[PDB]
Design an enzyme around this catalytic site. Structure first.
Site, PDB file in Angstrom:
ATOM      1  N   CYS A 153      -9.340   0.143   3.041  1.00  0.00           N
ATOM      2  CA  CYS A 153      -8.020   0.078   2.674  1.00  0.00           C
ATOM      3  C   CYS A 153      -7.289   1.349   2.001  1.00  0.00           C
ATOM      4  O   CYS A 153      -7.877   1.681   1.103  1.00  0.00           O
ATOM      5  CB  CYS A 153      -7.630  -1.113   1.807  1.00  0.00           C
ATOM      6  SG  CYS A 153      -5.806  -1.375   1.723  1.00  0.00           S
ATOM      7  N   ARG A 197      -4.800   0.461  -1.256  1.00  0.00           N
ATOM      8  CA  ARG A 197      -5.205   0.022  -2.488  1.00  0.00           C
ATOM      9  C   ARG A 197      -4.562   0.416  -3.854  1.00  0.00           C
ATOM     10  O   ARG A 197      -4.884  -0.347  -4.888  1.00  0.00           O
ATOM     11  CB  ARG A 197      -6.812   0.237  -2.608  1.00  0.00           C
ATOM     12  CG  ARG A 197      -7.456  -0.496  -1.803  1.00  0.00           C
ATOM     13  CD  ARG A 197      -8.873  -0.168  -1.885  1.00  0.00           C
ATOM     14  NE  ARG A 197      -9.281   0.931  -1.102  1.00  0.00           N
ATOM     15  CZ  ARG A 197     -10.570   1.489  -1.471  1.00  0.00           C
ATOM     16  NH1 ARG A 197     -11.396   1.118  -2.219  1.00  0.00           N
ATOM     17  NH2 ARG A 197     -10.732   2.637  -0.734  1.00  0.00           N
ATOM     18  N   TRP A 228       2.369  -4.568   3.712  1.00  0.00           N
ATOM     19  CA  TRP A 228       3.304  -4.125   4.718  1.00  0.00           C
ATOM     20  C   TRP A 228       2.289  -3.264   5.486  1.00  0.00           C
ATOM     21  O   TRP A 228       1.376  -2.571   5.214  1.00  0.00           O
ATOM     22  CB  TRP A 228       4.352  -3.532   3.956  1.00  0.00           C
ATOM     23  CG  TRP A 228       3.863  -2.497   2.968  1.00  0.00           C
ATOM     24  CD1 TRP A 228       3.387  -1.154   3.181  1.00  0.00           C
ATOM     25  CD2 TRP A 228       4.088  -2.688   1.697  1.00  0.00           C
ATOM     26  NE1 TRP A 228       3.169  -0.583   1.923  1.00  0.00           N
ATOM     27  CE2 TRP A 228       3.608  -1.363   1.091  1.00  0.00           C
ATOM     28  CE3 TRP A 228       4.460  -3.607   0.722  1.00  0.00           C
ATOM     29  CZ2 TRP A 228       3.421  -1.302  -0.448  1.00  0.00           C
ATOM     30  CZ3 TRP A 228       4.351  -3.546  -0.564  1.00  0.00           C
ATOM     31  CH2 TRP A 228       3.791  -2.370  -1.453  1.00  0.00           C
ATOM     32  N   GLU A 274      -0.181   2.001  12.463  1.00  0.00           N
ATOM     33  CA  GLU A 274      -1.017   0.816  12.826  1.00  0.00           C
ATOM     34  C   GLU A 274      -0.281   0.295  14.249  1.00  0.00           C
ATOM     35  O   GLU A 274      -0.986  -0.242  14.995  1.00  0.00           O
ATOM     36  CB  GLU A 274      -1.186  -0.461  12.037  1.00  0.00           C
ATOM     37  CG  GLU A 274      -1.706   0.196  10.584  1.00  0.00           C
ATOM     38  CD  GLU A 274      -1.887  -1.163   9.537  1.00  0.00           C
ATOM     39  OE1 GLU A 274      -2.600  -2.080   9.770  1.00  0.00           O
ATOM     40  OE2 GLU A 274      -1.227  -0.896   8.571  1.00  0.00           O
TER      41      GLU A 274
END
Ligand code: HEM
Ligand code: HEM
Ligand SMILES: CN(C)Cc1cccc(NCc2ccc3ccc(N)nc3c2)c1
Ligand SMILES: CN(C)Cc1cccc(NCc2ccc3ccc(N)nc3c2)c1
Ligand SMILES: C[C@H](O)[C@H](O)[C@H]1CNc2nc(N)[nH]c(=O)c2N1
Ligand SMILES: C[C@H](O)[C@H](O)[C@H]1CNc2nc(N)[nH]c(=O)c2N1
Ligand SMILES: [Cl-]
Ligand SMILES: [Cl-]
Lengths: 362, 362
Positions: free
Chosen positions: A65, A68, A237, A242
């Site tokens: 991630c 973070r 979000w 992506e």
């Protein structure tokens, strides 16, 4: 053996958790109660503070991630009280609503009752609460191929998609004691969608592209101090890449790059023209622009990388080891333009954390 | 211990090498001679066929190399006969000339005498035979910062750059028995350079960008069956991204993205505009176009990735394990548009291979 692993994970978690909360003196007594509770019941129950902080730690430990930095502002919804499929459904509907927050996305996790003897209380089949169906039948490709197997599972249960490229899958989950899951259509008023337009290429709308506002991962297991929360949907979000670089671009997803190349007025004939790279950039610009225009939260990969650098710095200042998966942290476009690309990360797994689990379908 | 490692590496190499050459029956006798040669001399000498094939195997085993499909057509120049700095110099000049081949680049390696007792016969200081100097002095950044330390080492030896952003460094190497290396200016007639222009943006030439045609790595050690060829410069042709996405784009190199953004008429103010990504693409298009226009070999990263897929397939058909470094094989632009991104690779080190070695300067 079972009550041994549990006790060990519990000792490690409570100590570290209470230490971060400034409650190091309450550890010995809380550990005493837990030891007793395990012996007698075969398990133990987290306080609200432990559960909340555990969920935050799990985000902080997610090596893959990039987002973070904001781990400590995670909104944790405790729904361990749920016993019925009506309650699960309404908890899922609520999560969507509060996380969406009219576009001002709140990172949120709803936590359902944990496994007991490894027996699941609630088993959520969706990969995300909001996702598009996919159909593969006789040369006809429709929708999101990543959703083909789950879609076919739903349709096996009486659901029928309209077979547009953007059918919203129903929520589908199974309660302990039932052989089959149940499914509930999503109220459209709960789902924000973003039509994709380009800031200066008017023809881009001819593509009729869109995406949903909030990615809500609903099939990962949260592990906190030996306790297995198999049902705990969470969301942040989107990072633009992506959607623009993977969901809409991958050949095994929506595969839109040739059509993007056409609407932006470039040929897609020669590798040396870098038409894919150019198409990728314009599509990704289009995604960021469109989300911003509708007032739905999104982050570009440069900003996200700058934020992650701050996360790295905060980790060092707090004396915490940093862990990360380089192969997932680098963005799928211009990775060398981020600092992430030019350093390495320790991919060790620290708990609390989020984990894959086996799909009930397929 | 020394003559033990050598013998072991030798047995493994000769067996595998002769097997691939279809000479498996000549192994036992060749291994006999080698064992005797080691006992008596403390080393052994490769035949021309072994050396040639060893160099090819070493390329084939280079986990970080995307261009490995063409491993078997490597042109191997045997210069183990060299004894003087004049001969080294002329071997280096020749390598450049024959590899350049008027722009039709021939992948080539020149092999110099190997180490004996770990003692180097020839020690080449250049990272590449053709590279640009770099200067860092009192706020003034000039040339290629990656070359700052080697440049300062040369200038410490009597060389002086003109301090343009593209000073060609001299060849610099040290012979066994000398305390200092010697340096020789490069004849300009041997070096092909490519001025960078854009296919449809005329202003792009205002940047006054250029690069050299042939990357000739001259500071890696080739290891073949226990024998350490510390001096063995090799070259392929460039993949465009190496120049466009790294050499000219990295903040710690030529750092050209803001100026690219300006000449292509876009603002460089907002991360959400993806101006870096867009600038990267246009610069990389410019690099490919310019090399193609001058008749100098180059490959784009999509074509290179397609070629690497064939290398993967050939490896399987030949029954060879494939090894690779995912973090280096993925291109620095649009990596997800290549197949490489979506699979994993075993990063195990197999010999023969090319290795880093310590810099004599710095
Ligand atoms: C606040 C906004 C957030 C952003 C922009 C963000 C960004 C990302 C991105 C880009 C990925 C890679 C996903 C992919 O390649 O498909 C990722 C992975 C991940 N994120 Fe986040 N994230 C955010 C919030 C969260 C939250 C709230 C959690 C959980 C509490 C979380 C946990 C994870 C996990 C577990 C993964 C890896 C999943 C896997 O291995 O498949 N993130 N994140
Ligand atoms: C024929 C054209 C070739 C192309 C297009 C090619 C492409 C590449 C690229 C793009 C890299 C990554 C470099 C970087 O990121 O800076 C690389 C690395 C490498 N290539 Fe190749 N290559 C070619 C020929 C060769 C040859 C002839 C050899 C040696 C016989 C070789 C051995 C290597 C090695 C050892 C590395 C890694 C060096 C390191 O770890 O720093 N390649 N190649
Ligand atoms: C389906 N999985 C078994 C593999 C897989 C494939 C592709 C993506 C993922 N995870 C995506 C993922 C997970 C968590 C996220 C959190 C926030 C965010 N913006 N994106 C996020 C995206 C996982
Ligand atoms: C200087 N090294 C210690 C680290 C380092 C940094 C950057 C690049 C490299 N190697 C670059 C390299 C090596 C071999 C190559 C072969 C062919 C080619 N086209 N590029 C090639 C590029 C190595
Ligand atoms: C095999 C490959 O390494 C793997 O599928 C990864 C690569 N990096 C990735 N990175 C992200 N963010 N998401 C992904 O799905 C992948 N795929
Ligand atoms: C630290 C980082 O992983 C490392 O420096 C790598 C990443 N991938 C790379 N890939 C290539 N081709 N070249 C490089 O110099 C790098 N840098
Ligand atoms: Cl997604
Ligand atoms: Cl280079």
């Amino acid at each position: 053996e079972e009550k041994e692993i549990l006790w060990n994970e519990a000792k490690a978690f409570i100590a570290a958790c209470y230490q971060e909360l400034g409650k190091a003196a309450e550890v010995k007594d809380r550990l005493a109660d837990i030891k007793s509770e395990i012996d007698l019941t075969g398990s133990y129950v987290h306080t609200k503070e432990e559960l909340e902080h555990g969920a935050k730690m799990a985000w902080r430990n997610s090596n893959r991630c990039i987002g973070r930095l904001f781990w400590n502002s995670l909104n944790v919804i405790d729904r361990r009280d749920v016993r019925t499929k009506e309650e699960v459904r309404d908890a899922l509907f609520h999560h969507i609503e509060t996380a969406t927050n009219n576009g001002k996305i709140r990172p949120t996790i709803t936590i359902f009752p944990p496994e007991e003897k490894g027996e699941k209380q609630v088993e959520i089949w969706n990969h995300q609460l909001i996702r598009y169906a996919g159909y593969e039948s006789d040369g006809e490709r429709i929708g999101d191929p990543a959703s083909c197997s789950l879609t076919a599972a739903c349709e096996e249960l009486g659901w029928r998609g309209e077979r547009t490229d953007f059918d919203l899958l129903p929520l589908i989950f199974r309660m302990k004691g039932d052989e089959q899951p149940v499914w509930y259509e999503l109220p459209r008023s709960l789902v924000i969608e973003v039509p994709i337009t380009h800031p200066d290429i008017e023809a881009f709308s001819d593509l009729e592209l869109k995406w949903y506002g909030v990615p809500i991962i609903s099939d990962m297991k949260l592990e906190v101090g030996g306790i297995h929360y198999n049902a705990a949907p969470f969301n942040g979000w989107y990072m633009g890449t992506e959607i623009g670089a993977r969901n809409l671009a991958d050949e095994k997803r929506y595969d839109k790059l040739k059509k993007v190349a056409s609407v932006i007025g470039i040929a897609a004939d020669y590798n040396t023209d870098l038409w894919k790279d150019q198409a990728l950039v314009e599509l990704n610009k289009a995604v960021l622009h469109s989300y911003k225009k509708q007032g739905v939260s999104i982050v570009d990969h440069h900003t996200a990388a700058s934020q992650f650098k701050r996360f790295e710095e905060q980790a060092e200042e707090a004396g915490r080891k940093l862990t990360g998966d380089w192969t997932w942290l680098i963005p799928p476009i211009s990775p060398a333009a981020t600092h992430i690309f030019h350093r390495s990360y320790d991919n060790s797994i620290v708990k609390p954390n989020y984990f894959y689990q086996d799909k009930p379908y397929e």
